[PDB]
């Protein structure tokens, strides 16, 4: 799996063996053009106060 | 985990024991900002020919 791991569109890192989920963190209460976070995950992370998480299981899908 | 499981904004199910992801399938191509499939997921589904899938892990996040 390769995931997007910056805010920008062609930098991606190959995910460690545990990790099988790209996530993308997105500012909840105020709309933004670029994500706040992007990386690999083992378990898809729960939403918090500030940030809204969304995951997928496919190369370069975040 | 309660996920939306229908095409409409309210109806949700209690996800069966051991399905701790909600998913939302959208039409991969066009600007239909509304889901073609939602429900509970064991592992987050891969992208398909025509749908793009997307998972999250809090109640009713999909």
Site of tokens 């995951």: A55
* Domain span including residue B13: 1-62
> Residue A24's closest CA among A61, B30, B43, B21?
A61
**Beta strand ranges found along chain B (DSSP E):** 2-4, 12-14, 21-27, 37-41, 51-52, 55-56
What percent of chain B is helix, strand and coil (3-state, nearest 5)? 0, 35, 65
Task: State how many domains chain A has.
Answer: 1
B27 touches chain A (CB under 8 A): no
Yes or no: say if A38 and A4 are a contact pair by the CB < 8 Å rule: yes
Domain harbouring B61, CATH code: 2.10.60.10
| A50 and A27 Cβ atoms separated by less than 8 Å | yes
What φ, ψ does residue B10 adopt, rounded to 5°?
-105, -60
The C-alpha of B51 sits at a distance from chain A's nearest C-alpha, in angstroms, of 12
Place of tokens 């109806």: B11
Q: Could you tell me the two tokens for B3? A: 């996920």
DSSP state of A4: E
Q: How far is A28 from chain B (nearest CA, A)?
A: 12
Token pair, residue A48, equals 């918090």
Helix then strand count (H, E) for chain A reads 0, 5
For tokens 């996530």, the residue is: A23
Label residue A62 exposed, middle or buried (CB < 10 Å: 0-12, 13-18, 19+): buried
Task: Identify the experimental approach.
Answer: X-ray
| Number of CB atoms found within 10 A of residue A41's CB | 18
Instruction: Give the chain A residue whose CA is nearest to the CA of B53.
Output: A56
Q: What are the E-state strand segments in chain A? A: 2-4, 12-14, 21-27, 37-41, 51-56
């Amino acid at each position: 799996l390769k995931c997007h791991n910056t805010q920008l569109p062609f930098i991606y890192k190959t995910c460690p063996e545990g990790k099988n989920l790209c996530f993308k963190a997105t500012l909840k209460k105020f709309p933004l053009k670029f994500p706040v976070k992007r990386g690999c995950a083992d378990n898809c992370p729960k939403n918090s106060a500030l940030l809204k998480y969304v995951c997928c299981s496919t190369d370069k899908c975040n």
